[PDB]
Amino acid sequence: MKQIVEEQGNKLHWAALLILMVIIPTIGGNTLVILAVSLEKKLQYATNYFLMSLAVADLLVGLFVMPIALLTIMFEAMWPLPLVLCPAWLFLDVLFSTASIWHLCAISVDRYIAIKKPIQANNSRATAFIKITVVWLISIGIAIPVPIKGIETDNPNNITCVLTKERFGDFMLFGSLAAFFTPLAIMIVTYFLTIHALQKKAADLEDNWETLNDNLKVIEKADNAAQVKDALTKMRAAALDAQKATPPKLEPEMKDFRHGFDILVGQIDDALKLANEGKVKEAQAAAEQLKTTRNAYIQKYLVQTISNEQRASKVLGIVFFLFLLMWCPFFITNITLVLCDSCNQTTLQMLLEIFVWIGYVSSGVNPLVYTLFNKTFRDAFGRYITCNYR
């Protein structure tokens, strides 16, 4: 058919679109995160070492994967680079993309552990390296079938760098399950686990609050010393119990309310030492002054603890939701490409060519968006874009 003219002429304007909107924001966005953790001494702790690893994983996407992904648009007919670069590029493409997804899955669980068990800390430098290594080891095992099986290449060196359904059909199915849907399910579970964790934490703080106040009236209306003795001990327990629901202020220039329990317990011990000697009327007067410590520190500590754990949980879910949501158009399409044979797989491959760039920008700017809710990071970025540093 001479009428049938598949020009397939030019797509340079789309490459300029992807550099300006996807590639540059990826490279620059992750360089700033790396710069911040590296040369800002106030940002160097166990969490940001894992976050910097994520920034490296996404910086390597826009530095190696995404630039060569444009040559598949300019020269969609045939692979221009040497043959050995085609399995290498596909390998790094699966490696780094999986490393970004599994990084957030670990961060999501780490944040949940920090809510259920705030005691463990200094979560040392080694615990970070263990988590870093495992994530990178998981991603290698998922990206390793690509170079092992290899391109489908006698040959005129005519190579199409693509994951065909005939050759990698079993990989595209189970490789999407392990790399995307498995950490997706984990983050759904840890989501509802966090809702239950923040509510159980608030209800316990509420009962510790009532325990203190109820025992105060027990002390005031007390007639016997033995009643005051087992009323301050129960207060001292509930005071330490509510204080253990928050990591020490050791681990911020403004007021620290968590110290009010150190003050509270110290007074309770003295007021109980008076109860041990027998000075009841003098001990009840000291328990009345426990309200001064309560009205100043304890009252605003309970709201500051619940509100901050609630706000940080909501913003962490949103940014981890949009990341997963923008990677959904690719993997859902990638699965049905194998599990649907009625579908036209020519246009179904065209959609994968588009949906990857939705996921690329989703991974590339993901560390930047996440760090733009930490003021120390933002103030560092504002000095870097003006080329200030120190």
Collapsed DSSP state (helix, strand, coil) of residue 340 = coil
Q: Least separation, in Å, of the C-beta of 189 and ligand OLC?
A: 9
Angle at which helix 85-116 crosses helix 66-74, to 10 degrees, equals: 140
Selected binder of ligand OLC within 96, 112, 355, 377 (CB under 6 A): 112
Confirm or reject binding of residue 162 to ligand H8D (CB under 6 A). Answer: yes
For residues 32 and 25, what is the distance between their CA atoms, to the nearest angstrom?
A: 11
Confirm or reject binding of residue 105 to ligand H8D (CB under 6 A). Answer: no
Binding mask 349-388 for ligand CLR (x = CB under 6 A): -----------------------------------xx-x-
Selected binder of ligand CLR within 18, 22, 23, 106 (CB under 6 A): 23
User: In this structure, what token pair is assigned to residue 204?
Assistant: 């316990």
List residues in the chain that are followed by a break over 2.5 Å (C to N). 122, 153, 251
Confirm or reject binding of residue 27 to ligand CLR (CB under 6 A). Answer: yes
Confirm or reject binding of residue 26 to ligand OLC (CB under 6 A). Answer: no
Interaction partner, residue 98 (ligand CLR, ligand OLC, ligand H8D, none; CB < 5-8 Å by kind): ligand H8D
Q: What is the DSSP string of 157-172?
A: S-------HHHHHHHH
For residues 147 and 70, what is the distance between their CA atoms, to the nearest angstrom?
A: 21
Selected binder of ligand OLA within 75, 174, 321, 389 (CB under 6 A): 174
User: In this structure, what token pair is assigned to residue 58?
Assistant: 């996404």
Cβ-contact 371, 33 below 8 angstroms:
yes
Q: Least separation, in Å, of the C-beta of 176 and ligand H8D?
A: 5
In sequence order, which residues have a C-beta less than 8 Å from that of residue 64 and are 6 or more positions away? 89, 92, 96
Binding residues among 152-191 for ligand OLC as defined by CB under 6 A: 187-188, 190-191
Selected binder of ligand CLR within 31, 127, 211, 284 (CB under 6 A): 31
Q: Least separation, in Å, of the C-beta of 173 and ligand H8D?
A: 9
Confirm or reject binding of residue 316 to ligand OLC (CB under 6 A). Answer: yes
Confirm or reject binding of residue 93 to ligand H8D (CB under 6 A). Answer: yes
Per-residue b or e along 363-376, where b marks 16 or more CB atoms closer than 10 Å to that residue's CB:
bbbbbbebbeeeee
In sequence order, which residues have a C-beta less than 8 Å from that of residue 18 and are 6 or more positions away? 66, 70, 357
Q: Which of 179, 191, 188 is nearest to 135 (CA)?
A: 179
Q: Least separation, in Å, of the C-beta of 174 and ligand OLA?
A: 4
Confirm or reject binding of residue 138 to ligand OLA (CB under 6 A). Answer: yes
Which range, of 12-20, 58-66, 165-173, 213-221, touches ligand OLA by CB under 6 A? 165-173
Confirm or reject binding of residue 91 to ligand OLA (CB under 6 A). Answer: no
Selected binder of ligand H8D within 356, 365, 368, 380 (CB under 6 A): 356
For residues 55 and 251, what is the distance between their CA atoms, to the nearest angstrom?
A: 24
Selected binder of ligand CLR within 28, 145, 317, 329 (CB under 6 A): 28
For residues 162 and 142, what is the distance between their CA atoms, to the nearest angstrom?
A: 17
Number of H helices, E strands in the chain: 16, 0
Q: How far apart are the first and last CA of the chain?
A: 68
Q: Which residues bind ligand H8D (CB under 6 A)?
A: 93-94, 97-98, 162-163, 172, 175-176, 179, 352-353, 356
Q: Which residues bind ligand OLC (CB under 6 A)?
A: 108, 111-112, 187-188, 190-191, 194, 313, 316-317, 320-321
Q: Which residues bind ligand CLR (CB under 6 A)?
A: 19, 23-24, 27-28, 31, 384-385, 387
